[PDB]
Design a protein around this ligand. Structure first.
Ligand SMILES: [Cl-]
Ligand SMILES: [Zn+2]
Ligand SMILES: [Zn+2]
Lengths: 349, 349
């Protein structure tokens, strides 16, 4: 419960970061942990698969013809690359809406290279550039589909947000009062719930993919979760973008898991049943959720990759694709190596 | 002690950050604390007044004619504004050296607005653009002055770095073995020592300023320390830059204190004797040092400003110049305030 990632300069402690993590089976049962695995935690973008489920379950959304890449964008914190903006526009045309209907705002790109090119051309980002633009088009779609009208689709009193709030609690297996709600950077309601339940959501996504693959009679909701998993794993460049952790992670694993960033350094992974998960002592899929207490994103990616290695998820060759995140470079302005990152935590079973 | 600064979204905890702080008198005696006031801490740029002392105490350096603004740049983590680069080049001319003699490297500017101009211009920062460039020119100056040789002025075996190492330990009142050393981003040795001793350095700076102002006989060391304080207080724009915390802080206080940032969220302040310092229980100058365990810079400035309020240093009107740092904006992409910062820590005496 005193679990840290620690950075050093020449062996001298620089910063230390408290780690919380939960590893759960398909029913949410805790298998491993770091820190406080039930920490009440703001899920932010890590909750988007649950918001995508509310959208996909809305009567009439099926008629718009969203494809797997559209759903991946719904699930995205994308880098605002030109292909992300283009897909946002295509999805707006599917529901006969326009950029002015979006109630999210522009922000500097989550990708440094994209942001640099915007600065170079004095580009001012707008609503269609939001990292959450696919989720917002999906919410516009649901509001239009049930004839609720698009103005106010983002407000808590709107039936689309009523559907979101109910769906999040159901996937977490919590009562409505056990989920807290604030306002997100994209101006939508955003939930907070115990960290282990974020893992439970992703364990259910991977379990639904396994059940779909195995030809099981799934409920419609399990079918839709299977679809969300498949969409994310098939189009991981839409979920984030070039150079991004989530994209590189999901590409490396080639369908064996999905992974998603949450704001202020949280992360969730849904792992399909495998030799690794069976070795970990469960007979189904697995869920992983992580939170760095102070919010440092660089440390998040380092810790998640170390956790994948300790859990034996993937092969050493597969995870070596993430080496630049696992041990972030610590070189000074003259090319001299001056420091490092250590993982003194111990996963408890 | 469980001393934190905490951010929230709608009252839901987002991130928390552990706080360490030391408030010391002129002899180093601990008056108040947060967290662990003796935490072994890399001083990084907060050590620069001690490095400047070692420069100014190198025999012959007086002959180059560095003025107070030059000395303020030796003490700086500047924003690489054009005036900082220009002064660096002027200082190299004073010592008949060239940019190729520097052993620090360029880096993206510490100022977002400067770095935005650089991006629009495709400007590549070079050695004279380093936030440490003034310190490096001073070290070259001292190497030249004693006849050592400029090659290797930055290496631990060089007499300039031997002088730095001895000077840091003396100011801290530590044996050599109680100061650890690593290599800095600017490619110089950088010390680590207990956090309270950083406060001690700055108490001694402010105490020397008081002794000079009162006309007391001073040792060559105290006279040099008083000069460093005066240079920083008179030229705070050289120590950091427009819009930077250290510059706004020192301008607001108009000579009553000096302050300096260290990388990975450390800060140090030397306070001249005043009603505030007497009210705090000491009869001379005071030093303050702070470290955010996880290295978040926004949180550091919020904590330092909150600490000055709690210590009664300044007036509500002097401190209000720092209001944007004290309570950082938490506004989303649509202009809605979504949260805030809180200070659940308790000063202890
Ligand atoms: Cl470095
Ligand atoms: Zn969002
Ligand atoms: Zn430096």
């Amino acid at each position: 419960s005193e679990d840290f990632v620690v950075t050093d300069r020449g062996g001298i402690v620089e910063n230390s970061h408290r780690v919380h993590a939960a590893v759960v089976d398909a029913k949410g049962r805790l298998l491993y942990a770091l820190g406080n695995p039930t920490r009440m935690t703001l899920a932010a973008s890590a909750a988007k698969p649950a918001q995508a489920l509310a959208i996909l379950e809305t009567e009439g959304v099926a008629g718009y013809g969203f494809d797997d890449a559209d759903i991946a964008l719904m699930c995205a914190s994308h880098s605002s690359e030109d292909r992300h903006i283009a897909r946002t526009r295509a999805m707006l045309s599917k529901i006969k809406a326009e950029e002015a209907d979006l109630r999210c705002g522009g922000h500097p790109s989550l990708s440094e290279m994209v942001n640099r090119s915007w600065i170079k051309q004095d580009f001012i980002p707008t609503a269609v550039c939001s990292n959450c633009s696919g989720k917002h088009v999906g919410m516009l779609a649901g509001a239009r589909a049930i004839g609720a009208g698009t103005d106010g689709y983002h407000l808590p009193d709107h039936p689309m947000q009523g559907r979101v709030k109910r769906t999040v609690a159901e996937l977490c297996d919590l009562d409505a009062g056990d989920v807290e709600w604030g306002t997100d950077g994209c101006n939508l309601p955003t939930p907070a719930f115990p960290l282990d339940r974020l893992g439970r959501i992703y364990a259910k996504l991977a379990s639904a993919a396994d059940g779909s693959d195995a030809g099981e009679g799934q409920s419609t909701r399990c079918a839709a979760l299977a679809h969300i998993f498949r969409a994310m794993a098939r189009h991981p460049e839409m979920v984030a973008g070039e150079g991004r952790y989530c994209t590189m992670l999901m590409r490396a694993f080639d369908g064996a898991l999905v992974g998603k960033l949450g704001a202020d350094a949280s992360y969730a992974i849904g792992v399909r049943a495998s030799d690794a998960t069976r070795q970990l002592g469960t007979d189904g899929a697995l869920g992983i959720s992580v939170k760095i207490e102070d919010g440092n994103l660089e440390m998040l990616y380092a810790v998640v990759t170390e956790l994948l290695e300790r859990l034996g998820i993937g092969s050493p060759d597969v995870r070596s694709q993430l080496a630049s995140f696992h041990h972030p470079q610590r070189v000074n302005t003259m090319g001299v190596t001056t420091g490092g990152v250590s993982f003194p935590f111990k996963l408890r079973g």
